[PDB]
Paper text:
A novel monoacylglycerol, 7.10 MAG, has been produced for use in the in meso (lipid cubic phase) crystallization of membrane proteins and complexes. 7.10 MAG differs from monoolein, the most extensively used lipid for in meso crystallization, in that it is shorter in chain length by one methylene and its cis olefinic bond is two carbons closer to the glycerol headgroup. Two distinctly different membrane proteins, one a β-barrel and the other a mix of intramembrane α-helices and an extramembranal αββα sandwich, as well as the α-helical adenosine A2a G protein-coupled receptor (A2aR) were crystallized in 7.10 MAG by the in meso method, yielding high-resolution structures in each case. These findings attest to the utility of this lipid for future campaigns aimed at the structure determination of novel membrane proteins and complexes.
The first was the alginate transporter, AlgE, an 18-stranded β-barrel protein with a molecular weight of 51 kDa that resides in the outer membrane of P. aeruginosa. Crystals of AlgE grew readily as thin plates at 20 °C in the cubic phase formed by 7.10 MAG. The crystals displayed anisotropic diffraction to 1.45 Å resolution with electron density of excellent quality enabling the modeling into density of 459 out of 479 residues in the protein. Two stretches of the protein were disordered (109–117, 440–449) corresponding to loops on either end of the barrel. The hydrophobic surface of the protein is coated with 11 lobes of density that have been modeled as 7.10 MAG. They are configured in a way that is reminiscent of how lipids that make up the bilayer membrane in which the protein resides naturally are arranged. The structure includes calcium and sodium atoms as well as sulfate and citrate ions. The citrate sits in the core of the barrel and is taken as a mimic for the mannuronate and guluronate components of the alginate copolymer. As was observed with AlgE crystallized in 9.8 MAG, the hexahistidine N-terminus folds into the core of the barrel where it associates with the citrate and sulfate ions. By contrast, AlgE gave rise to a sample in which the cubic-Pn3m phase with a lattice parameter of 111.6 Å dominated.
Author numbering: 13 to 108, 118 to 439, 450 to 490
Write the structure that this text describes.
Amino acid sequence: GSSHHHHHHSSGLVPRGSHMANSGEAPKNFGLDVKITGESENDRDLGTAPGGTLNDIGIDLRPWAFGQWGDWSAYFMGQAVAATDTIETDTLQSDTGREPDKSYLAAREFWVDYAGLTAYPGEHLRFGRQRLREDSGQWQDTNIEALNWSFETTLLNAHAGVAQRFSEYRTDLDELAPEDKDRTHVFGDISTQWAPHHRIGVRIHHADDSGHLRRPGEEVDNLDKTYTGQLTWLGIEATGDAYNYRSSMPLNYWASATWLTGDRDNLTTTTVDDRRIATGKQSGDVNAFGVDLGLRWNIDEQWKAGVGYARGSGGGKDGEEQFQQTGLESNRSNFTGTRSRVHRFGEAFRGELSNLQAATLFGSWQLREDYDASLVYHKFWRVDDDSDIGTSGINAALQPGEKDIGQELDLVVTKYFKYVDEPSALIRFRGGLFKPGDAYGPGTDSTMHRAFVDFIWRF
Ligand SMILES: CCCCCCCCC/C=C/CCCCCC(=O)OC[C@@H](O)CO
Ligand SMILES: CCCCCCCCC/C=C/CCCCCC(=O)OC[C@@H](O)CO
Ligand SMILES: CCCCCCCCC/C=C/CCCCCC(=O)OC[C@@H](O)CO
Ligand SMILES: CCCCCCCCC/C=C/CCCCCC(=O)OC[C@H](O)CO
Ligand SMILES: CCCCCCCCC/C=C/CCCCCC(=O)OC[C@H](O)CO
Ligand SMILES: CCCCCCCCC/C=C\CCCCCC(=O)OC[C@@H](O)CO
Ligand SMILES: CCCCCCCCC/C=C\CCCCCC(=O)OC[C@@H](O)CO
Ligand SMILES: CCCCCCCCC/C=C\CCCCCC(=O)OC[C@@H](O)CO
Ligand SMILES: CCCCCCCCC/C=C\CCCCCC(=O)OC[C@@H](O)CO
Ligand SMILES: [Ca+2]
Ligand code: NA
């Protein structure tokens, strides 16, 4: 069930001979996930700077081990990558002692788990570097060192945990991103299925930085923090089979509203002879708000379509209304109603919900467990046209006073195999075409793309 070590993986594949493939089989003690990935990307800086283009291939091997003894269990998954350039073989990868190598080894997960606090198999406590994920992917979808308690039953779901990055556990990245250094996350949620297939819930997340900012006069480089924060996200979420590709209902929906409160100390800098020097810091409250809404029409067993709107506040008095996400999110979810997860704000733009408004349209198709396809359109705007947006897959400056971020068309197409009841492999095309709007200004490329083919096999 939900405690299975691959439960959260987007692939949704089942190895031949596993207990999940046939319940008469014993749980596997080991396996191998093999991934071959090609990536073409051009041009992430919209032509404004040298580099930013990829046309490259790689292999990513992920052996894993699992043991189970009464209420105790334990899991390890390693990772070895070899590629022709530094492509993305991992949708959850650290965004980048921060220069990745073409080839590297990593310890992806390593945890121990105790399920004995209660008799519910959906209840367990997990300690170590582990996959944390909730269904929207907008709060947590990452591998991180954590102590996390899960409780999943028919009428009640709840979770609580703490997490913090201490290393990347990678042979090529020796340092943490500044945003992660000394940042502790505590989180939890409670929800209930108040009617068959409809859930309502509350969610909380708190991030606290124990690190310090550079002092005035000190040089500032890319490994220093830009701010320290104490931030709390408090949300309400309602869903009707939002992320369930097997739904029986004719309509599926999601609605969430999140209030971000707390305080940030923002480092100030100036440039002095081509160098960046700290000049001080300024504190201020944050009082910001995010919303994501979606409606999906299940037209028949195979065809679906829908619409989405999301907005993360921006700007405001001393920047207090600048919404931002936890930093643990992927923003990838099954929001098109298929077995494949899709980036909620574009495979190319990869928007974070921060000073950003997005309108989305999608269609999808699927056949049994054998195929799926999704076509997604997005239009993006800034909320406050004198404030930055958050992270994105585009490295180009925004022009003050322009709200038109751009538009994007994405296509995902997947074949599952090894008709197959429980597939053990897949081949997927995932592409996004991004058309920058007026916020990107003159001299930028008219279009940009990011496209992948992935072949994944689980043994
Ligand atoms: C404590 C904080 C970090 C978590 C530590 C987790 C380390 C776990 C790495 C282990 C991988 C899974 C299997 C190890 C034990 C397997 C074992 O000998 O089981 C006995 C038998 O059932 C099969 O060999
Ligand atoms: C090993 C480190 C532990 C850190 C966390 C401390 C745990 C303290 C005890 C927690 C208990 C949580 C269970 C509460 C809910 C139980 C429940 O609703 O019913 C359980 C019962 O009906 C079935 O056996
Ligand atoms: C229902 C089963 C799913 C069917 C899947 C069909 C796959 C279609 C794949 C198509 C890929 C390439 C599409 C053309 C690219 C056009 C393009 O880049 O235009 C750029 C230009 O318009 C910008 O001004
Ligand atoms: C259902 C069909 C959907 C897509 C159909 C159109 C064709 C898709 C072509 C694939 C594009 C992904 C781009 C990355 C592929 C890997 C790549 O560029 O390899 C470069 C080399 O092999 C290394 O030099
Ligand atoms: C700009 C986008 C277009 C406008 C969209 C407007 C959408 C309005 C937002 C939807 C509100 C969600 C209502 C909650 C759903 C669950 C509900 O109604 O009650 C849950 C239970 O009854 C609790 O027992
Ligand atoms: C343009 C983008 C916005 C479109 C989506 C807006 C709507 C999002 C969904 C939110 C609320 C819909 C109302 C919930 C209805 C479900 C419900 O209460 O069912 C009642 C119960 O009897 C079910 O069996
Ligand atoms: C279920 C039957 C098949 C799916 C039904 C339609 C859903 C798929 C359509 C999605 C994306 C394709 C591109 C749409 C272009 C949108 C566009 O240009 O919007 C107008 C533009 O002025 C900006 O608002
Ligand atoms: C089948 C279609 C159903 C879904 C319709 C789309 C979803 C709701 C659209 C409503 C509002 C979102 C658009 C906000 C636009 C704000 C805006 O353009 O501000 C900046 C403006 O100066 C243009 O650059
Ligand atoms: C019904 C299908 C609609 C087609 C439009 C989908 C847009 C998202 C996909 C993005 C880009 C094109 C995908 C096909 C392969 C692209 C590719 O290999 O580009 C090579 C690159 O060197 C282009 O110069
Ligand atoms: Ca470039
Ligand atoms: Na339990």
